[PDB]
């Protein structure tokens, strides 16, 4: 009982996910605009039967889902494609008008493999304050892969109980190094890996690695007791600068 451009919602989402082809989302705040945009994009959906499923989504009720398509919050109408298989997101520029011509070119590019998957990132923080350096996807290379510095990097999730138990100690470690004679050469850093796409393949949280100066292709994964004392030892034993 459903039209070519269906409705993406609580009842329909799992079938869209199990269909095994990508899903294009037409976000609009009102049903009227949803219908207008559906009519404009229908010939694209028609041409892509069996290759991409298209659907409308209620941006009033489900606006927060735009973020999970690496779209910007609260800028509608909006369009994006989700490659379910590879978990990749292809947002369409929300400063641009959604038209038949623009979306057709975007979709053709997608099918042709001509668009690079978007990268999820928090923004670069304006100021670097607090003794633990905040890493996001956009500054990972610059901070973590800085070949002149021994970089301790914690990959964490905010919903994780273990990460919460580590936080105060990891902070105390950062404050210690920031006041030490090693403040020039040791970096103590953290990254919310659920809010940033990072290169590392993380199996569970928290994970801590050392990326030593001059050996950035051989990070060392930490597997000790997670005490401040044991982390200092780890840094001194595995870092280029033997910094403790």
Which pairing describes strands 78-83 and 88-91: parallel, antiparallel, or unpaired? Answer: antiparallel
Q: Is 219 a catalytic residue?
A: no
Q: Is 105 a catalytic residue?
A: no
CA distances to 106, 120, 144, 186, 228 from 125, rounded to whole Å, are 31, 15, 15, 20, 26
User: What is the maximal distance between C-alpha atoms in the chain?
Assistant: 70
Which residue ranges make up each domain of the chain?
A: 1-121, 122-244
Please give the CATH number for the structural domain made up of 1-121.
3.40.30.10
Resolution in A: 1.9
Q: Beta partners for 198?
A: none
- Cβ-contact 185, 213 below 8 angstroms: yes
Residue 166 CB contacts under 8 Å (≥ 6 apart), including other chains: 154, 156, 206, 226
Which segments of the chain are extended strands (E)?
5-7, 23-28, 53-58, 78-83, 88-91, 133-135, 150-156, 186-192, 207-211, 220-221
Token output for 169? 């100690």
- Residue of 160, 167, 232, 244 marked catalytic: 160
Residue 209 CB contacts under 8 Å (≥ 6 apart), including other chains: 152, 153, 155, 200, 219, 220, 221, 222
Q: How long a stretch of residues is the chain?
A: 244
- Residue of 44, 107, 163, 166 marked catalytic: 163
- The pair phi, psi for residue 68, each rounded to 5°, is -80, 0
End-to-end CA distance of the chain: 68
- Cβ-contact 233, 220 below 8 angstroms: no
CA angle in degrees (0–180, nearest 5) for 221-200-141: 105
Rounded Cα distance, 209 and 153, in Å: 5
CA angle in degrees (0–180, nearest 5) for 185-189-192: 160
Rounded Cα distance, 219 and 232, in Å: 16
**What determination technique applies here?**
X-ray
Query: Which one of 3.40.30.10, 3.40.50.150, 1.10.287.540, 1.10.1040.20 gives the CATH number of domain 122-244?
Result: 3.40.30.10
Rounded Cα distance, 243 and 111, in Å: 51
**Is 122-244 in the same CATH topology as 1-121?**
yes
CA distances to 50, 160, 172 from 232, rounded to whole Å, are 56, 24, 11
Chain breaks in the chain (C to N over 2.5 A) after: none
Q: Is 100 helix (H, G, I), strand (E, B) or coil?
A: helix
């Amino acid at each position: 009982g459903s039209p070519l451009i269906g409705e993406i919602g609580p009842e329909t989402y799992s079938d869209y996910m199990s269909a095994g082809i990508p899903l294009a989302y037409i976000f609009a705040e009102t049903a009227e605009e949803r219908k207008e945009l559906s009519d404009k994009l229908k010939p694209i959906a028609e041409a892509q039967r069996g290759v991409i499923n298209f659907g409308t989504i209620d941006a009033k009720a489900f606006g927060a889902h735009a973020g999970n398509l690496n779209l910007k919050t609260d800028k509608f109408p909006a369009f994006a494609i989700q490659e379910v298989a590879k978990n990749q997101k292809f947002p369409f520029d929300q400063e641009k008008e959604i038209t038949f011509e623009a979306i057709k070119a975007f979709v053709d590019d997608f099918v042709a493999g001509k668009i690079e998957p978007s990268i999820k990132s928090e923004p670069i923080p304006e100021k670097q304050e607090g003794p633990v350096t905040v890493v996001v996807a956009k500054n990972y290379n610059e901070i973590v892969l800085d070949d002149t510095k021994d970089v301790l990097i914690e990959f964490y999730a905010p919903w994780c109980g273990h990460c919460k138990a580590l936080a105060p100690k990891y902070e105390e470690l950062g404050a210690l190094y920031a006041k030490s004679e090693f403040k020039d050469r040791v970096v103590i850093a953290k990254v919310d890996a659920t809010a940033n796409d990072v290169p590392d393949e993380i199996q569970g949280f928290p994970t801590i690695k050392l990326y030593p100066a001059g050996a950035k292709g051989q990070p060392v994964t930490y597997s000790g007791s997670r005490t401040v004392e044991d982390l200092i030892k780890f840094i001194a034993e595995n870092g280029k600068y033997k910094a403790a």
